């Protein structure tokens, strides 16, 4: 008699990425780990989500590669943000090489350039503070780091002229990453129109700067933008076009900003708390002076590399409040772990947050002890500390992140003396990148 109305589409989105926007179920999963042990599963919309906790369990996740574990489906939200044929928009062939061009742009050689530029940038930034006040370091370090990134990662042109422009465009891309945007990246909604618009505006800006530089081999430049122009595929008359270069710029910002920003923020919020400051700031300050004795007052990479106690405080911030809570992969080729079997199609997760609160790995995991890392430096077992992931897809910007954040905090330890305003912040689980919840306040007093 009467028919069904027309079906327009049948959509079955990848559920995994929803954990980044589930509002921080670190509670619910710590329970599950403590009842069922280091491997366990959750069915949601008929999609198996298997979790891997602590070192042993990590091994299948981090030790395997692209034939066995896929990054494509979890990171598919990033394709329209960076553009087509860029990282997770490019076929495997092209992507592995595109990572090589990033790896080059952040190699030790490359950072040697950036360290003077990162140092000036921050010494100038922190000059403008008064003799006194109170300030939200999260907003502070966010400004600073976006500055520092434009200088190092986008060259001198964009930095000193067009920062405001680039800062707003980035802000629009970031504002185009709603919770829907991980399940339907291409859904036509105003936020995604605004996103795609700002992305093209970023390419425009970047064509001008490339073309200006196309005309003038008269200079060679010491920044990522140059590295991306000098990069070529295997054999190919294919160099990297304007869209592609821009993409990798945007991905360097998207990975760069928030993670370094919040970790920098957490580093200081934990150190200048009352109990922590008594126990750990003397260690840290002696070190800044002992570094001054030998190397001088200018911060160089040689000197930043010797700040072990400061490093350990950053790393302890990172251990306790990791900024990315879950890294994930779709299983292309099943594996075994202890008794268990993990099928094709599963989505495996490792949670830095969760794994670095395991007691048999990190004694007193609920408490701030940066000095715990003098013993970790003796353990040879892999995948104990996984804030920066590991294996072949682990964090390429790790040293950058440590240099940026140690520079920031060195310059603040030299010039100012600092106390935390009231209670330590609890983490804000709204956004994809977890940071301390505003307002995150630090009293600064100078010293002549």
Judged by DSSP in three states, 226 sits in: helix
Least distance (Å) between residue 4 CB and ligand HEM: 24
104 binds a copy of itself (CB under 8 A): no
Residue 69 in contact with residue 331, Cβ under 8 Å? yes
393 binds ligand HEM (CB under 6 A): yes
Among candidates 146, 366, 365, 160, which has minimal Cα distance to 260?
A: 146
Site string for a copy of itself, 321-360 (x = CB under 8 A): ---------------x--xxxxx-----------------
Choose from ligand HEM, a copy of itself, none: what does 35 bind? Cβ within 5-8 Å by kind: a copy of itself
327 binds ligand HEM (CB under 6 A): yes
Question: CB count, 10 Å around CB of 119?
Answer: 22
431 binds a copy of itself (CB under 8 A): no
Least distance (Å) between residue 445 CB and a copy of itself: 31
Question: CB count, 10 Å around CB of 347?
Answer: 25
**Residues of the chain immediately before an interruption (C to N > 2.5 Å):** none
What are the structure tokens assigned to 46, written together?
Answer: 């008929």
Residue corresponding to tokens 């069922």:
36
Residue corresponding to tokens 């670095």:
356
141 binds ligand HEM (CB under 6 A): no
Least distance (Å) between residue 389 CB and ligand HEM: 3
Choose from a copy of itself, ligand HEM, none: what does 43 bind? Cβ within 5-8 Å by kind: a copy of itself
**Cα–Cα distance list, 366 to 122, 276, 316, 320 (Å):** 32, 13, 11, 8
How many Å apart are CA 304 and CA 288, to the nearest integer? 10
Least distance (Å) between residue 77 CB and a copy of itself: 13
Residue 265 in contact with residue 419, Cβ under 8 Å? no
Least distance (Å) between residue 43 CB and a copy of itself: 4
The per-residue DSSP string of 385-436 comes to: --TT--GGGS-TTHHHHHHHHHHHHHHHHHHEEEEE-SSPPPEE-SSSS-EE
Q: Which of 59, 99, 117, 191 binds a copy of itself (CB under 8 A)?
A: 191
Q: Which is nearer to ligand HEM, 410 or 444 (CB)?
A: 410
Residue corresponding to tokens 């682990």:
394
Q: Which is nearer to a copy of itself, 28 or 289 (CB)?
A: 28
Residue 75 in contact with residue 88, Cβ under 8 Å? yes
Q: How would you class 30 by CB atoms within 10 Å of its CB: exposed for 0-12, middle for 13-18, buried for 19 or more?
A: middle
435 binds ligand HEM (CB under 6 A): no
How many Å apart are CA 80 and CA 197, to the nearest integer? 11
What are the structure tokens assigned to 94, written together?
Answer: 């092209």
Known binding residues for heme: 395
How many Å apart are CA 273 and CA 261, to the nearest integer? 19
Q: Which of 388, 409, 416, 444 binds ligand HEM (CB under 6 A)?
A: 388
Site for ligand HEM in 233-272 (CB under 6 A): 252, 255-256, 259-260, 263
Least distance (Å) between residue 112 CB and ligand HEM: 15
Choose from ligand HEM, a copy of itself, none: what does 260 bind? Cβ within 5-8 Å by kind: ligand HEM
50 binds a copy of itself (CB under 8 A): yes
Q: Which is nearer to a copy of itself, 38 or 66 (CB)?
A: 38
Site for a copy of itself in 15-34 (CB under 8 A): 18, 21-25, 27-28, 31-32
5 binds a copy of itself (CB under 8 A): yes
Cross-strand pairs, 134? 443
Residue 370 in contact with residue 273, Cβ under 8 Å? no
Side-chain-side CA neighbours of residue 181 (13 Å): 22
76 binds ligand HEM (CB under 6 A): no
- Interface residues toward ligand HEM, by CB under 6 A: 71, 99, 102, 106, 252, 255-256, 259-260, 263, 318, 322-324, 327, 387-389, 393-397, 400-401
- Interface residues toward a copy of itself, by CB under 8 A: 1-13, 18, 21-25, 27-28, 31-32, 35-37, 39-46, 48, 50, 178-181, 184, 187-192, 336, 339-343, 426-427, 429-430
């Amino acid at each position: 008699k009467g028919k069904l109305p027309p079906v327009v589409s049948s959509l079955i989105p990848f559920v995994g990425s929803g954990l980044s926007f589930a509002g921080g179920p670190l509670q619910y999963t710590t329970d599950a780990y403590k009842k069922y042990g280091d491997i366990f599963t959750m069915k949601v919309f008929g999609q198996r989500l298997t979790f891997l906790v602590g070192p042993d369990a990590h091994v299948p996740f981090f030790s395997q590669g692209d034939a066995e574990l896929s990054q494509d489906e979890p990171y598919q939200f990033s394709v329209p943000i960076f553009g087509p044929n860029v990282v997770y928009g490019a076929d495997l062939a092209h992507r592995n090489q595109q990572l090589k061009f990033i790896a080059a742009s952040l190699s030790t050689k490359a950072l040697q350039s950036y360290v003077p530029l990162i140092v000036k940038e921050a010494e100038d930034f922190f000059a403008k503070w008064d003799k006194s006040g109170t300030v939200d370091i999260r907003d502070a370090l966010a400004e600073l780091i976006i500055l520092t990134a434009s200088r190092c990662l986008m060259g001198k042109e964009i930095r000193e002229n067009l920062f405001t422009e680039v800062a707003k465009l980035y802000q629009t891309l970031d504002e185009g990453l709603l919770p829907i945007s991980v399940f339907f990246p291409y859904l036509p909604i105003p936020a995604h129109k605004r996103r795609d618009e700002a992305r093209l505006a970023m390419v425009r800006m970047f064509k001008k700067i490339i073309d200006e530089r196309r005309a003038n081999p008269e200079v060679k430049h010491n920044d990522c933008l140059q590295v991306f122009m000098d990069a070529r595929y295997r054999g190919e008359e294919q160099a990297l076009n304007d869209e592609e270069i821009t993409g990798l710029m945007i991905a360097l910002l998207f990975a760069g900003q928030h993670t370094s920003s919040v970790t920098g923020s957490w580093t200081g919020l934990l150190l200048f708390e009352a109990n922590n400051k008594k126990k750990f700031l003397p260690g840290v300050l002696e070190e800044q002076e002992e570094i001054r004795k030998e190397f001088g007052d200018e911060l160089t990479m040689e000197a930043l590399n010797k700040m072990d106690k400061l490093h350990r405080c950053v790393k302890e911030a990172l251990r306790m409040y990791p900024p990315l809570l879950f890294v994930m992969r779709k299983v292309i080729k099943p594996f075994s772990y202890k008794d268990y079997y993990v099928p094709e199609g599963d989505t495996v997760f490792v949670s830095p947050a969760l794994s670095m609160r395991v007691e048999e790995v990190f004694p007193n995991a609920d408490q701030y002890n940066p000095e715990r890392f003098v013993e970790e430096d003796k353990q040879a077992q892999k995948y104990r500390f996984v804030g920066f992931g590991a294996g072949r897809h682990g964090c390429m910007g790790e040293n950058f992140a440590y240099l940026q954040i140690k520079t920031i905090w060195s310059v603040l330890l030299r010039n100012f003396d600092i106390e935390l305003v009231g209670e330590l912040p609890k983490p804000d689980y709204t956004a994809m990148v977890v940071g301390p919840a505003h307002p995150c306040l630090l009293r600064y007093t100078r010293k002549h």
